[PDB]
Amino acid sequence: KRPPGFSPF
């Protein structure tokens, strides 16, 4: 769902 390169947590 979230975009590419999303940070952890």
Swiss-Prot record:
Coiled-coil positions: none
Site note Cleavage, residues: 8-9
4-hydroxyproline sites (modified residues): 4
Protein's name according to its UniProt entry: Lysyl-bradykinin
Organism name: Homo sapiens (Human)
